[PDB]
A paper describes a structure:
By engineering a small secondary structural element from the rabbit light chain constant domain into the human kappa light chain, we dramatically improved the crystallization of human Fabs and Fab:antigen complexes. Alignment of a human Fab structure onto a rabbit Fab showed that the longer FG loop present in human Kappa constant domains forms a bent and bulging conformation that would interfere with a beta sheet packing interaction. In the case of the FG loop, this consisted in replacing the septamer human sequence HQGLSSP (positions 198 to 204 according to Kabat numbering) between the structurally homologous T and V (position 197 and 205 respectively, according to Kabat numbering), with the pentamer rabbit sequence QGTTS (positions 199 to 203 according to Kabat numbering). The resulting mutant is shorter by two residues, with deletions of histidine at position 198 and proline at position 205, and is referred to here as ΔQGTTSΔ (positions 198 to 204 according to Kabat numbering).
One is derived from the publicly available dupilumab (Dupixent™) sequence. The parental light chain was the wild-type kappa. The parental heavy chain terminated at the sequence ESKYG and included six histidines for purification purposes. Structures of the Fabs variants without the ΔQGTTSΔ, including the parental, did not pack with extended beta sheet interactions. The parental dupilumab Fab for example packs with various types of interactions, but none that form a continuous beta-sheet. Besides the FG loops the only substantial difference between the parental dupilumab Fab structure and the structures of the engineered variants is that in the parental structure the heavy chain CDR3 and light chain CDR1 loops are disordered.
Author numbering:
A (entry chain B): 1 to 31, 34 to 217
B (entry chain A): 1 to 61, 63 to 100, 111 to 139, 145 to 224
Write the structure that this text describes.
């Protein structure tokens, strides 16, 4: 097959600055007809055509995106990046079956530091009934992505009994959000009183703690 | 309005089979080559197969003698017969309009696994000062995906539906949350609308 080599793999950009992505093929794709396309896939969406046949923009794709190149060497440029541009960009050869794609480039948006708003949720009575307690902590709308969540139960530090998930960077405000779930048996839940989620983040002068008390 | 709508994804054990369909609207279906592309959980894009406008020519990636691409122009429908399923076949499969790939379906999920279908339990997330949060915890389901909207789709601002995490049990859990003005908390309704098609489970839960 034709190998498609794409770089960089990660592309941090502040809105209004340009961005460039290169794609190098292991064989010429000039059949002025270069069979190379550019696709973008935003979080949770299908891929969408940005450029086809090297340089031709898909129907509603704006001026600020362009494709150029010939032979084995191609470049997607975005002359001015917007927050909504966040996503993964892939090059693809349609010269020959099998169509093959680059490794993909993650375009990340840079913005100012933003402290999470933090919230703790108790387990529902509904849940408690079936014999399990999930306690949830939410860090809403923060930047940058690195954040530390520390669960505490009657002031004991927990480890090994939580899981965390992080949203993809928001396309409006370029923040992330994170949810961490502490899972305990109902029996354990009922042994202890004080449940706390402590959050450390760049935007926070000192760690923020949210808590509740089982009664 | 050119549109591709896929269905027929779901869960099967390895060696099993699944049929995917992709229905086209708003163009002459017969005039175009049609293509299947897949994306494995957390991976990039990978070409699977193509079929010409007439269905006279077919092309295949690893799928050679397991998968069959076909089309029925009379219904404007593309097909991917998937037999002898393997673990590596687990992915979101997109349909795309070909001879760039200018229009793509929404995708349909295919999971190949020893594990069986299980519908989720949905639990409210609510406080035990200007902004408040509420959510739904969608616990212990298999396979992916689940869909979550709020207020039947009327609430989209401040919603975050988190990636599911695989629990040690081998079942997924996810939360979906929205932040809202605290002052509205007495008078407005917040309802999460959860759908897990593989188990035919739908739940509307008004979170108080």
């Amino acid at each position: 097959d034709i190998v498609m080599t794409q770089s960089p793999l990660s592309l941090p950009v502040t809105p209004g600055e340009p961005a460039s992505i290169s794609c190098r093929s292991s064989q010429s794709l000039l059949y002025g007809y270069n069979y190379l396309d550019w696709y973008l896939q935003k979080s949770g969406q299908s891929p969408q055509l940005l450029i086809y046949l090297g340089s031709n923009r898909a129907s509603g794709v704006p001026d600020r995106f362009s494709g150029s190149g010939s032979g084995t060497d191609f470049t997607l440029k975005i002359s001015r990046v917007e927050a909504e541009d966040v996503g993964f960009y892939y090059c693809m050869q349609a010269l020959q079956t099998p169509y093959t794609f680059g490794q993909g480039t993650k375009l990340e948006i840079k913005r100012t530091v933003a402290a999470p708003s933090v919230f703790i949720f108790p387990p529902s009575d509904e849940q408690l009934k079936s014999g399990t307690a999930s306690v949830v902590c939410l860090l809403n709308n923060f930047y940058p992505r690195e954040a530390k969540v520390q669960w505490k139960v009657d002031n004991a530090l927990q480890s090994g009994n939580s899981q965390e998930s992080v949203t993809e960077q928001d396309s409006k405000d370029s923040t992330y959000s994170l949810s961490s779930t502490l899972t305990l048996s109902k029996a354990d839940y009922e042994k202890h009183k004080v449940y706390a989620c402590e959050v450390t983040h760049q935007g926070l002068s000192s760690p923020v703690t949210k808590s509740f008390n089982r009664g | 309005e050119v549109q591709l709508v896929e269905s027929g994804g779901g869960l099967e054990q390895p060696g099993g089979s699944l049929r995917l369909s992709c229905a086209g609207s708003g163009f002459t279906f017969r005039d175009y080559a049609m293509t299947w592309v897949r994306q494995a959980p957390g991976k990039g894009l990978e070409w699977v197969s193509s079929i010409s406008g007439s269905g006279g020519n077919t092309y295949y990636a690893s799928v050679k003698g397991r998968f069959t691409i076909s089309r029925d122009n009379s219904k404007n429908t593309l097909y991917l017969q998937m037999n002898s399923l393997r673990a590596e076949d687990t992915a979101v499969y997109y349909c795309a309009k070909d001879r760039g790939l200018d229009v793509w379906g929404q995708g349909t999920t295919v999971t190949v696994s020893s594990a069986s279908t299980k519908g989720p339990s949905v639990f409210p997330l609510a406080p035990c000062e200007s902004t408040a949060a509420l959510g739904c915890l969608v616990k212990d389901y298999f396979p992916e995906p689940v869909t979550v909207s709020w207020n039947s789709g009327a609430l989209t601002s401040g919603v975050h539906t988190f990636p599911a995490v695989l629990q040690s049990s081998g079942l997924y859990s996810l939360s979906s949350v929205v932040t809202v003005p605290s002052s509205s908390l007495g008078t407005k309704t917040y309802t999460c609308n959860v759908d897990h098609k593989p188990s035919n489970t739908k739940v509307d839960k008004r979170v108080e």
